[PDB]
């Protein structure tokens, strides 16, 4: 018996370090230190994909969303490491990681809106913002109009489906 919330909170610390490591390597022109930072971010993305995968099978979608957030943040670290280093092969893998998190975050948001689970939807709609903000930035440094439009549309679904809940949770006769 363990605590998946603690595995979450630990993975939160590892991207913050991977982001800090990439920052230190970048500001000081250390190509070997970029590689050690990129290797750390590659673990978390693989670690975040497993936890989100497992949490989906047991039906706790709140963990799934929080795991997809860490997947998004790791995709942002790997993205800017690939850019400051001319590696377009990582930017593809980084974009497809953020896009998969954006795809799954919409699934949970779409189904939570269908059930009336207002809290799951808003939490999932928060993660769509995080994934869509990263998809747009990554697609900008890659010249992909379609995923840039995808990031634009996803943000509007975050705004519209949240607006529904806001009007749908208004006072009785306001």
């Amino acid at each position: 018996e363990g605590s998946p919330r603690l595995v979450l909170r630990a993975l939160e610390n590892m991207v913050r370090a991977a982001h800090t490591l990439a920052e230190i390597a970048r500001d000081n022109g250390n190509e070997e230190w970029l590689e050690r930072a990129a290797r750390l971010a590659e673990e978390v993305a693989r670690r975040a994909e497993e936890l989100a995968r497992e949490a989906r099978k047991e039906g706790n979608l709140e963990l799934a969303l929080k795991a997809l957030q860490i997947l998004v943040n790791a995709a942002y670290v790997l993205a800017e490491i690939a850019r400051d280093r001319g590696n377009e092969e990582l930017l593809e893998k980084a974009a497809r990681l953020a896009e998969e998190a954006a795809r799954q975050a919409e699934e949970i948001a779409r189904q939570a809106r269908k059930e009336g689970n207002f809290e799951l939807a808003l939490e999932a709609l928060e993660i769509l913002n995080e994934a869509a903000r990263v998809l747009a930035r990554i697609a900008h440094h890659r010249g992909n109009q379609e995923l840039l439009e995808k990031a634009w549309r996803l943000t509007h679904r975050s705004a519209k489906w949240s607006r529904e809940i806001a009007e749908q949770a208004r006072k009785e006769g306001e």
Copy 2:
């Protein structure tokens, strides 16, 4: 009845969306997208101001202050868009929204300070920082020194009254 907790988190997602749209439009130079981003941010400014008014008429000051920061967040997005499009009519509209948030935030701090409710007072003084951060950025992007002194005076008020409450609890 209704759920103000749901209305808040829904409003919070809506500002985050408007902030993202403004960034996506800005980084890609799509002026038509900037209009859509500003239209949504001005929308949330209504909702936040409306709920803040309703929440205070009930005396629910925590909900009110949480609504006032949504104003500051919505007002800050509008200010950044007016910075790009050269739109002077929105800089005026954006500053008046932050001035209104700093207005109500200080009044709730004064009443809570006079009632001994120091937790609420410190939460209200946080929003003066939020509002004055926007007015300072606006005053810089329009060269207005009178508004800098406002933002500086309001930021300085947040620290002065917070230290007073801190030593009251020593």
Copy 3:
């Protein structure tokens, strides 16, 4: 009420941060010194609240007092870089170095005591402190302190991974 004293201190760092932004973006030298004295003030205040709460056994309060210390150390460091003041970079280095120790010490105690939540809460402040020390070492030309902040960040990642394996389900 130390939770109230803490909450007020988190407000002044936000204030000290904003005043420095107003001063830097508008080049007002009298305002920058004004912001620095507020930043160093909270760092000294937060330093006292941390040891008060730690000698009392309230480690959650001590860590949140340590983040305020890190944030104030960041405010002073950003001011010193934009103003080329080497004596202020030294003060910012002390404050982040102090926070880096206590974050690592509390992490060791809570980890040996099995409190994995505090351990991760203390390890996150290591990132906060090491990230500040890294920028200081860059704008100050010190390779050893840079190398120090680089081990400190790895320790945040390495010790978190172990707790990540200590907390997984047995399947």
